[PDB]
Structures are given as C-alpha cells and as structure tokens.
Amino acid sequence: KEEEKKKQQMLTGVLGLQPTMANHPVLGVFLPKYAKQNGGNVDKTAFRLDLIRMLALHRLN
C-alpha cells in the first residue's frame, strides 16, 4: 500500500504527469525502478532526463 504511494509521489515529482501518461508502457515499466530510488538524495532532474531519453529510445520508428 505504501509502495503505491511512493510510485505516485515520484510520478508527481518527475513532471506532475497525469495518470493517463502513467499508464504508458515506458512509464509502467520504469516507475517501479524509480520507486527503488529517489528516497536517496540523488536528484529530481535526473529522473526527468532519464524519462526523456528512455521515452526517446522507445519511439524509434
């Protein structure tokens, strides 16, 4: 129960993404890995750039 709140809190911290984008596959796979982090002092910007480059890797037509 607490893990879902961590996932959602990190989702709002990354960009304030809407749940509609939370359902996206790149998000659906990476939100659990971003859960096992960001509890550390790491950053908020790093996660935005990571989502950027991963979303980019995903969309190679």
Binding site: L15, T45, I52
Partner: peptide, 12 residues
C-alpha cells in the same frame, strides 16, 4: 528541459 518535455513529447 527548455527545448522540449512540455506538450508534444509526453503525449502517450
């Protein structure tokens, strides 16, 4: 983060 990330690039 200023060139993009706002509207079109987060469209699902």
């Amino acid at each position: 983060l200023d060139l993009f990330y706002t509207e079109p690039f987060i469209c699902p």
